[PDB]
Amino acid sequence: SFDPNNPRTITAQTLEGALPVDILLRLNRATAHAIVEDARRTLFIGTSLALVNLRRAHDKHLVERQPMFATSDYSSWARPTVGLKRTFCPR
Amino acid sequence: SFDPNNPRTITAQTLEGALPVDILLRLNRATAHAIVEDARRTLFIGTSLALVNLRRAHDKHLVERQPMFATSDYSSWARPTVGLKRTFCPR
Amino acid sequence: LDVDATLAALRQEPAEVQCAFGAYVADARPDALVGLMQRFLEEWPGMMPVRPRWAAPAAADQLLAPGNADLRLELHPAFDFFVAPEVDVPGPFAVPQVMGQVRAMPRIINGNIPLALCPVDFRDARGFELSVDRHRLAPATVAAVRGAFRDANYPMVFYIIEAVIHGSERTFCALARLVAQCIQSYWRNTHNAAFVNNFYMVMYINTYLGNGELPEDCAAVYKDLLEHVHALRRLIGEFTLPGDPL
Amino acid sequence: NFYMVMYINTYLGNGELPEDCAAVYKDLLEHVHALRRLIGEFTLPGDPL
Amino acid sequence: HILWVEMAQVNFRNVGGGLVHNRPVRNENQPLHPHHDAEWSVLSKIYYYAVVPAFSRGNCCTMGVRYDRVYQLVQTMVVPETDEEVGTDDPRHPLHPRNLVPNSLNVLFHNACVAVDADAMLILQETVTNMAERTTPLLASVAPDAGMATVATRDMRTHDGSLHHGLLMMAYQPNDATLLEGAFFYPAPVNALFACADHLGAMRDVGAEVRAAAQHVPCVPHFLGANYYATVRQPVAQHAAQSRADE
């Protein structure tokens, strides 16, 4: 998706590519300070976007996510609000 | 691959033959000092080459070998280097 | 609580400046908060020409030797008398070179009596006095907690999970499944506890998981560690006469 | 071997060893650590001579 | 007083004076109210001043953490696309060696020989919704209360600090190279109790002489209160370290 020997080439355009495996494998085959940290910053944002995309892809096959905590109540007068412990909801 | 009663006949030409089983079985059917140790030396090298060839043949069917130790870092600024304990990677 | 005359009677001597480490605090500009340790460690050997006294106390008896330089400054059971530079605290991060002075500061706690005048034996004996028929820790619980605290290959992933949770509430009821799996794995691995380093975590464990996904011989540890702190809290409640907010 | 018994509880440790066998090597190292800490209290702290 | 923060504006490099309320509450999200009862902090103080030094006996150390890299590591996970969970035996499970790439986060979970499912592994994606910028030192300054309230004690105030969003590690493991020494945690001792000497070695660029002169003196820095202006002097720390009283 980019070349490691140049940090100036990473950005949202190239990091949109795929899952974090591509990021990590790209960084694996490598061979002033403002450049590298700006690069670190967008790399962080890119890997977060990659991770949320991975979760979307895997969550298309999972159960719905309930609200964990009670006490946030709008139609409270009818039902008493009760949270849910997310102890295990695997599928 | 050679005859045991003559040490002067072993060399890289004859030891290239096959796996260490051939070396050991040849030495099994046997029946000044500079000759025998020079022979010991090339026999050692030959059996090492045999063993690495055996490992090639058997490793054509195994998993890739990761670097075991962390801290050797070239693109460190992006990812933190983490080694791998080779506790078990059998296939 | 009358030490006004003692200070006026002590400063008549010129100075006895021996060091400056243990009696000087400096404010720091909000610069780096990770590099302040860098700037401090590099300067530290420059602050200790000779050994700081408070660090290594004199001895059990040699404090009462007829010539040492510590009896001169231990003359009240409820105060501390030392030497510190003539500045107003806090001060600059670079330590100054001003001729010293003799300050004072009350021991807020009885535990701050130096060991030469309150031996560890008496303290342990008083504790064992208070410890009878109040509440205890079954040997199974303490064998686990000490084994945990004394481990030298503690899995770093637990520290990572601690730093990422940072003692919130939403994140713990989000990660409950992973935390339970980690606790279960470690328990069936080495028969110790986990997350005992943090307190909010050891609270959340027994207030959320509790009767649920943890084993009946693993939750006992996390309930004991809380009931003991509860007994400790209750302790001071019966050593106070009912008085008025002062 | 000392380096061996050290690497044992350093790397292997919580891993492939059974729940019981590793206690032997853990104790054999904690004992050496305690013996090391012993001399740490029998020397009045002073300046290097 | 600043509220929750997201991946949108994190700004790890912020050095100003501001502390975070991690998703302030469960329900309310109203201005400026604490979300725990008063006695909570008292129980915390009890735990950290009376039970920790009972078991540790002068081994623990308050550690300053690198919130940038821990987040940089929690993100890179490796999980394939499977409808149903199958178990660690299958080569699709995230713990099987095949899909264990180098320097990922799953390799760490394998370093601890723990067993987890890919679902709980993915659950970690929730953390980016409430960040934690940095760990910062504090410095309290209180005067003696109505007890020691004599005219000659009006100004003999105290000085003690603490860490915000810090972390206390138990025992240092110097002899491993599965990770860098000062990777995620730099030593930041706040009080004489939680200040060992082996943790200073974790700090990058340690001196040749400071570590030699670090065993017989507590290494609390001089911008976090000294041994004379603090409410917890040395003798209590020495007590818990050289006695033997059945813990």
Side-chain angles (χ1 to χ4, degrees):
Chain A
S1 169
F2 50 93
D3 67 74
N5 311 359
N6 245 41
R8 297 142 254 172
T9 88
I10 60 166
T11 192
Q13 299 155 11
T14 162
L15 278 279
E16 77 131 317
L19 307 162
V21 236
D22 276 56
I23 297 75
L24 190 93
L25 289 158
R26 208 45 63 166
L27 290 161
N28 222 7
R29 48 172 38 160
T31 291
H33 43 319
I35 315 206
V36 57
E37 182 280 335
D38 304 14
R40 178 183 308 150
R41 197 177 193 280
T42 59
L43 184 92
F44 171 49
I45 308 201
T47 66
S48 101
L49 259 52
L51 180 79
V52 66
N53 275 330
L54 182 123
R55 188 165 182 292
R56 191 37 68 103
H58 205 115
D59 189 78
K60 279 172 77 205
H61 291 302
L62 279 185
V63 62
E64 282 186 328
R65 289 180 59 242
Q66 298 305 351
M68 54 177 48
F69 284 150
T71 61
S72 294
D73 36 346
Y74 174 84
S75 89
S76 105
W77 52 268
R79 84 187 182 296
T81 299
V82 182
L84 189 150
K85 289 168 194 201
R86 285 223 278 265
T87 60
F88 52 73
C89 309
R91 278 295 91 200
Chain B
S1 169
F2 50 93
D3 66 74
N5 311 359
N6 245 41
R8 297 142 254 172
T9 88
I10 60 166
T11 192
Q13 299 155 11
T14 162
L15 278 279
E16 77 131 317
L19 306 162
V21 236
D22 276 56
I23 297 75
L24 190 93
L25 289 158
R26 208 45 63 166
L27 290 161
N28 222 6
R29 48 172 38 160
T31 291
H33 42 319
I35 315 206
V36 57
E37 63 185 342
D38 304 14
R40 178 183 308 150
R41 196 177 193 280
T42 59
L43 184 92
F44 171 49
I45 308 201
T47 66
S48 101
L49 259 53
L51 180 79
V52 66
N53 275 330
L54 182 123
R55 188 165 182 292
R56 191 37 68 103
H58 205 115
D59 188 78
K60 279 172 76 205
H61 292 302
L62 279 186
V63 175
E64 282 186 328
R65 288 180 59 242
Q66 298 305 351
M68 54 177 48
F69 284 150
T71 61
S72 63
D73 36 346
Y74 174 84
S75 89
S76 105
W77 52 268
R79 84 187 182 296
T81 299
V82 182
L84 189 150
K85 289 168 194 201
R86 285 223 278 265
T87 60
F88 52 73
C89 309
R91 278 295 91 200
Chain C
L1 290 164
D2 168 37
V3 295
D4 216 327
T6 305
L7 298 190
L10 261 191
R11 303 187 205 281
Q12 291 309 281
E13 298 301 295
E16 307 93 322
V17 182
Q18 49 85 25
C19 173
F21 173 51
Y24 179 54
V25 53
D27 50 9
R29 313 292 289 268
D31 285 25
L33 63 86
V34 178
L36 272 295
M37 302 291 293
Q38 303 265 358
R39 267 215 275 156
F40 162 65
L41 284 184
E42 181 262 359
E43 197 271 329
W44 192 23
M47 274 196 303
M48 294 150 37
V50 297
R51 301 182 53 78
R53 289 274 55 69
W54 56 271
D61 73 270
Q62 275 72 27
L63 181 50
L64 305 192
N68 65 357
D70 213 340
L71 283 200
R72 298 268 332 263
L73 288 177
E74 187 68 75
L75 51 91
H76 197 283
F79 278 92
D80 271 21
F81 299 81
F82 47 74
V83 286
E86 169 72 13
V87 307
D88 213 18
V89 296
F93 198 85
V95 62
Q97 296 296 110
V98 176
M99 181 179 71
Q101 199 197 15
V102 171
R103 291 192 192 283
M105 196 157 172
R107 305 192 182 89
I108 309 311
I109 315 185
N110 84 323
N112 311 308
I113 305 292
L115 283 179
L117 318 177
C118 172
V120 304
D121 176 29
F122 154 66
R123 310 206 190 200
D124 175 38
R126 175 220 290 186
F128 178 54
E129 210 285 337
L130 270 189
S131 65
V132 181
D133 66 271
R134 279 283 172 81
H135 172 58
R136 281 193 156 182
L137 286 79
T141 304
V142 72
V145 74
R146 168 164 46 80
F149 269 102
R150 287 281 186 150
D151 180 281
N153 46 23
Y154 197 44
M156 202 81 64
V157 309
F158 299 147
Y159 286 145
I160 309 289
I161 291 183
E162 285 284 352
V164 66
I165 278 178
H166 60 264
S168 87
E169 196 89 20
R170 302 192 64 108
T171 55
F172 195 91
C173 202
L175 304 173
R177 192 154 211 285
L178 167 64
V179 173
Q181 289 293 268
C182 274
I183 292 171
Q184 185 71 356
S185 74
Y186 196 59
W187 169 266
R188 90 170 67 173
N189 185 4
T190 184
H191 274 285
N192 303 341
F195 304 123
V196 61
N197 62 337
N198 170 286
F199 171 68
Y200 284 67
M201 291 275 297
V202 78
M203 179 78 68
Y204 289 143
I205 291 308
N206 77 92
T207 185
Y208 283 147
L209 300 93
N211 52 356
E213 286 282 313
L214 297 205
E216 71 296 329
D217 206 68
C218 203
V221 173
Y222 291 94
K223 281 170 190 164
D224 269 9
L225 269 299
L226 200 46
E227 70 170 6
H228 185 220
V229 186
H230 263 289
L232 276 167
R233 163 70 189 90
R234 269 187 296 173
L235 183 134
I236 56 185
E238 62 259 5
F239 281 60
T240 61
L241 294 174
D244 192 293
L246 197 61
Chain D
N1 259 327
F2 178 54
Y3 284 69
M4 285 284 296
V5 69
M6 175 85 62
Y7 293 138
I8 282 291
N9 51 43
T10 310
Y11 289 169
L12 165 51
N14 51 10
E16 309 321 309
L17 271 167
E19 57 88 21
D20 198 301
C21 306
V24 177
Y25 307 83
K26 280 183 186 171
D27 212 8
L28 217 56
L29 202 54
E30 192 47 284
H31 194 216
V32 167
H33 264 296
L35 260 72
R36 161 72 172 92
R37 290 189 297 273
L38 185 145
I39 68 190
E41 72 154 349
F42 274 34
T43 81
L44 262 59
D47 180 86
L49 273 166
Chain E
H1 159 88
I2 74 185
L3 277 302
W4 54 267
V5 291
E6 299 253 5
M7 75 304 293
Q9 298 328 119
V10 49
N11 198 236
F12 302 87
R13 314 321 291 262
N14 171 223
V15 299
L19 263 52
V20 290
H21 270 188
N22 48 9
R23 291 301 284 167
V25 298
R26 47 153 177 183
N27 55 5
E28 206 51 45
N29 294 21
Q30 286 319 97
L32 273 295
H33 76 120
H35 51 103
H36 286 89
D37 178 30
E39 58 155 352
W40 199 270
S41 65
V42 165
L43 271 69
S44 68
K45 263 184 291 187
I46 290 301
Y47 188 98
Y48 278 122
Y49 278 161
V51 187
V52 181
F55 305 139
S56 178
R57 287 184 164 86
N59 276 336
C60 47
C61 164
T62 55
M63 304 283 322
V65 60
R66 267 172 157 198
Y67 279 148
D68 45 5
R69 293 188 181 279
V70 54
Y71 277 127
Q72 283 314 320
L73 286 206
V74 62
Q75 51 209 44
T76 79
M77 304 179 292
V78 172
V79 165
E81 199 80 73
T82 80
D83 188 353
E84 70 285 339
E85 300 77 50
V86 58
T88 187
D89 170 271
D90 188 288
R92 296 195 309 272
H93 191 272
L95 273 296
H96 178 79
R98 189 272 309 272
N99 44 22
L100 286 183
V101 291
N103 315 314
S104 89
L105 168 63
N106 213 325
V107 55
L108 272 186
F109 272 70
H110 186 62
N111 286 122
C113 206
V114 305
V116 73
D117 189 300
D119 313 303
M121 189 73 197
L122 175 49
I123 295 311
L124 262 182
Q125 82 92 22
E126 183 53 285
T127 179
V128 299
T129 65
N130 56 274
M131 297 294 183
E133 323 178 51
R134 65 196 190 268
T135 185
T136 177
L138 295 89
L139 196 75
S141 306
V142 300
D145 53 2
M148 297 69 66
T150 297
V151 166
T153 53
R154 183 64 183 166
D155 49 311
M156 296 298 175
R157 43 172 53 249
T158 81
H159 286 117
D160 175 23
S162 301
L163 300 188
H164 178 77
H165 273 306
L167 178 53
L168 188 142
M169 75 182 290
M170 318 213 296
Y172 191 56
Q173 180 47 270
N175 188 78
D176 194 355
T178 318
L179 291 97
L180 187 55
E181 171 137 4
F184 312 98
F185 317 112
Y186 40 94
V190 54
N191 194 304
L193 280 74
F194 327 117
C196 202
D198 315 334
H199 293 285
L200 283 189
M203 179 145 168
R204 289 262 45 80
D205 179 92
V206 68
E209 193 207 330
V210 297
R211 190 189 165 98
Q215 274 87 1
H216 318 81
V217 286
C219 76
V220 67
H222 69 81
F223 67 96
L224 280 171
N227 178 275
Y228 282 150
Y229 289 97
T231 186
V232 180
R233 320 285 190 80
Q234 164 72 15
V236 58
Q238 182 164 348
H239 177 191
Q242 67 154 64
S243 177
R244 53 194 198 286
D246 188 81
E247 64 189 357

